[PDB]
Short mmCIF file of all heavy atoms in Angstrom, two decimals:
data_model
loop_
_atom_site.label_atom_id
_atom_site.label_comp_id
_atom_site.label_asym_id
_atom_site.label_seq_id
_atom_site.Cartn_x
_atom_site.Cartn_y
_atom_site.Cartn_z
N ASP C 95 -14.90 -3.78 3.00
CA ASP C 95 -15.55 -4.58 1.96
C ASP C 95 -15.11 -6.03 2.09
O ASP C 95 -14.17 -6.50 1.43
CB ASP C 95 -15.23 -4.00 0.58
CG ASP C 95 -15.82 -4.81 -0.54
OD1 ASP C 95 -17.05 -4.76 -0.73
OD2 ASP C 95 -15.05 -5.50 -1.24
N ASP C 97 -16.90 -8.91 1.39
CA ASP C 97 -17.31 -9.86 0.35
C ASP C 97 -16.39 -9.80 -0.86
O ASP C 97 -16.04 -10.83 -1.44
CB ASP C 97 -18.76 -9.59 -0.05
CG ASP C 97 -19.01 -8.14 -0.40
OD1 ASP C 97 -18.05 -7.34 -0.36
OD2 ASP C 97 -20.17 -7.79 -0.72
N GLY C 98 -15.99 -8.60 -1.27
CA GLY C 98 -15.11 -8.43 -2.41
C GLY C 98 -15.69 -7.68 -3.59
O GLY C 98 -15.01 -7.57 -4.61
N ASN C 99 -16.91 -7.16 -3.48
CA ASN C 99 -17.50 -6.40 -4.57
C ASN C 99 -17.11 -4.93 -4.43
O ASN C 99 -16.24 -4.58 -3.63
CB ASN C 99 -19.02 -6.63 -4.61
CG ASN C 99 -19.71 -6.26 -3.31
OD1 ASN C 99 -19.35 -5.28 -2.65
ND2 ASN C 99 -20.72 -7.04 -2.94
N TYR C 101 -19.02 -2.33 -3.37
CA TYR C 101 -19.90 -1.57 -2.49
C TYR C 101 -19.69 -1.99 -1.05
O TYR C 101 -19.34 -3.14 -0.77
CB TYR C 101 -21.37 -1.76 -2.88
CG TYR C 101 -21.73 -1.20 -4.23
CD1 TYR C 101 -21.62 -1.97 -5.38
CD2 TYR C 101 -22.18 0.11 -4.36
CE1 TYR C 101 -21.95 -1.46 -6.62
CE2 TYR C 101 -22.52 0.63 -5.60
CZ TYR C 101 -22.40 -0.16 -6.72
OH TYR C 101 -22.73 0.36 -7.95
N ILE C 102 -19.89 -1.05 -0.13
CA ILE C 102 -19.81 -1.33 1.30
C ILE C 102 -21.23 -1.42 1.85
O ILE C 102 -21.98 -0.44 1.82
CB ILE C 102 -19.00 -0.25 2.04
CG1 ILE C 102 -17.55 -0.25 1.56
CG2 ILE C 102 -19.06 -0.48 3.54
CD1 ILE C 102 -16.69 0.81 2.22
N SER C 103 -21.60 -2.59 2.35
CA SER C 103 -22.93 -2.79 2.89
C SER C 103 -22.97 -2.44 4.37
O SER C 103 -21.94 -2.34 5.04
CB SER C 103 -23.39 -4.23 2.68
OG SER C 103 -23.37 -4.58 1.30
N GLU C 106 -21.65 -5.33 6.27
CA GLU C 106 -20.19 -5.30 6.20
C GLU C 106 -19.62 -4.23 7.12
O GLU C 106 -18.61 -4.44 7.79
CB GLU C 106 -19.74 -5.08 4.76
CG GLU C 106 -20.33 -6.09 3.80
CD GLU C 106 -20.07 -5.73 2.36
OE1 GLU C 106 -19.06 -5.05 2.10
OE2 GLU C 106 -20.88 -6.12 1.50
CA1 CA D 203 -19.52 -5.42 -0.24
#
Side-chain angles (χ1 to χ4, degrees):
Chain C
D95 177 73
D97 51 2
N99 58 37
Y101 294 89
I102 296 178
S103 302
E106 306 170 27

